[PDB]
């Protein structure tokens, strides 16, 4: 789970990490009005999207750059009106972009040098790692590719934790000299503590800044949180606006149904991420385009199949539904009835293909054939694919 910059910045502020003092403006005029409440020489404006590369982005309004700075508050609002509502298209987002809504108006600070820094859980390092480069900025990936040996890695022991020598060496490798080496090293340790405190899979500050006045500041905040840790990170997961993605995705989450959309007419429905992806794959092999897919995992509940069909069919772009449940805990002859009832108490005007395989499937598909509803069972995976594609003519 990713949070906006302003939401992360406060987490960093309340945990000893220094960052620019800012104001969140919902409207376009309130961006410049907040630029006055702040009162500072140079102001910085940032579009809030759950993505990076904002600086090198392009708005659908023709605005070049997702981040700008100036000394005139009147200019802040001038750029805010033509930022809010439009889609910012950075190289991390799809070609369409991300609709901007909020804007951050912070106290811009002069930058004497930029360094990249990131804390994260890496499978190769079997735990937390310090990842930094002295030449950071928006061009970090290019510097990391052409000059791979400017990327410094320092594996952290989860039991012992961040050692003073590790933080001191990282700061040195980032080129923090003199008294700043102590300051940067301390901010590194404070970031690692916040990293573990919030169950974050990634904490990235780019650029890990160094002001001409001798201050080490985190100018950018990109945090990826561990979804599995939500049960102990209530306040953190309550911040997710949830309104950037389609309102059907989070509605599907009301019943623990992981949903993602696509561009097609076949609405898939599978009990497993890997299998559900292969489902969308073999459909592509047969000339069909999956509209989306619902993932159940392993648990099977009547309430889910009743809603499931509701969500997929609520998408007017659906012309058929493909059920592929291979390994449910419930004698899926039971959910097989849940498919007949979910369809009867809903009718639906689109065909429906089903492929079940598990605890006594012989009797399970007997309920479907003698039901009287547009249900066409399938024997194997390749079978369900061809039938789904054929039913959209």
């Amino acid at each position: 789970m990713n949070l906006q910059e302003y939401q992360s910045k406060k987490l960093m502020s309340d945990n000893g990490v220094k960052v620019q003092r800012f104001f969140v403006a919902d409207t376009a005029n309130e961006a410049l009005e907040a630029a006055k409440r702040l009162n500072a020489k140079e102001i910085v404006l940032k579009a809030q999207i759950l993505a990076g590369g904002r600086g090198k982005g392009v708005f659908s309004s023709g605005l070049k750059g997702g981040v700008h700075l100036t000394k005139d508050p009147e200019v802040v609002g001038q750029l805010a009106k033509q930022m809010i509502g439009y889609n910012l298209a950075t190289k991390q987002t799809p070609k369409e972009g991300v609709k901007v809504n909020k804007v951050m108006v912070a106290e811009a600070l002069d930058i004497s040098r930029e360094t990249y820094l990131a804390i994260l859980m890496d499978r190769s390092c079997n735990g937390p790692v310090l990842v930094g480069s002295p030449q950071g900025g928006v061009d970090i990936e290019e510097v990391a590719a052409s000059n791979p040996e400017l990327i410094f890695k320092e594996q952290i022991d989860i039991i012992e934790g961040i050692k003073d020598s590790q933080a001191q060496r990282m700061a040195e490798n980032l080129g923090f000299l003199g008294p700043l080496q102590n300051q940067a090293a301390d901010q590194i340790k404070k970031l690692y503590n916040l990293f573990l405190k919030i169950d974050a899979t990634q904490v990235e500050v780019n650029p890990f800044g160094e002001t001409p006045e001798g201050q080490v500041v985190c100018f950018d905040a990109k945090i990826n949180f561990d979804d599995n840790a939500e049960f102990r990170q209530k306040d953190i997961f309550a911040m997710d606006d949830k309104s950037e993605n389609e309102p059907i995705e989070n509605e599907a989450a009301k019943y623990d149904l992981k949903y993602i959309g696509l561009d097609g007419n076949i609405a898939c429905f599978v009990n497993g991420a890997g299998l559900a992806m292969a489902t969308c794959d073999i459909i592509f092999l047969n000339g069909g385009k999956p509209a989306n897919f619902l993932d159940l995992g392993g648990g099977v509940k009547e309430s889910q199949v009743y809603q499931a069909f509701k969500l997929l069919t609520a998408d007017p772009k659906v012309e058929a539904i493909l059920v592929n449940i291979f390994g449910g805990i419930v004698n899926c002859a039971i959910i097989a009835n849940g498919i007949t009832k979910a369809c009867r108490e809903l009718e639906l005007k689109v065909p429906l293909v089903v492929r079940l395989e598990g605890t006594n499937v012989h009797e399970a598909q007997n309920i479907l054939t003698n039901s009287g509803l547009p249900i066409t069972s399938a024997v194997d995976l390749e079978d369900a694919a061809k039938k789904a594609v054929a039913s959209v003519t």
Binding site: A118, M121, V131, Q202, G274, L275, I282, L285, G298
Partner: protein, 303 residues
Amino acid sequence: SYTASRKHLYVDKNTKVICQGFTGKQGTFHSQQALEYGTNLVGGTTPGKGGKTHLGLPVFNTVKEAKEQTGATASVIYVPPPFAAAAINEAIDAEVPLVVCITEGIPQQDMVRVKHRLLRQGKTRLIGPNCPGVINPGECKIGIMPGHIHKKGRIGIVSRSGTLTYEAVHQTTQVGLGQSLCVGIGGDPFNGTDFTDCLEIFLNDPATEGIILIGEIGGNAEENAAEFLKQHNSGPKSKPVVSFIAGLTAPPGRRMGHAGAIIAGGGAKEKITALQSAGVVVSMSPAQLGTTIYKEFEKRKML
């Protein structure tokens, strides 16, 4: 070192299994299916309820209490995620040879701690978390996979996905090849067993003549396994290997950070060609895994 405990992955009918979270809803279910399939389940555990009888088997408070009193050599875990990480450490403290954690949703930070000490000991081998389990067709069944699609055969299966694993198992049984040993390593990034560990067992298992590896986009696990076969499965005794990677049609995710790219340098074309370079037959269709491994035997006259 930890690699020593690889051997404990190959269960048989002599392995005496116990269930952590026995009285739980899932622990109760799959324990029944385990006993019905013929698995040697000798009891389970649930804090505060040690001493009662569940499914005709004893219930204990702790693993050591259940182990020494039943001679268990394998333990399966259905504890909820918040306390699943602890259930694993208890088994390691009890020095259980094989621990299979089915629970999904364990915080990565917890598993980083579990894996930290796990790699400092060679007595306990872990599978998972967030995995279907391991099954020796006909002999032992530790996990949630449906046992009515498994025939003891000649093909060893290692899968990173979940329900997708059942496709290869089902398909390999129809063509008549059956399965020698199916193992699901799970989806969580910090787990106790990877592709290489299972490839090490399959290549060293005479009963395993063909191999099927089921991965998917994300990470570099598929590339790592590819480089292993390039070193240990090349030349004279080259066992045929088949694979399918799910998600080659999936869209590209919405990123937020430069860290991922800097560490990678990932999915589909990368994993496919890399796997192929090691000499493995990558099936493009998920439904044509059994048909592929079969003809690979026919091409080499192994049927």
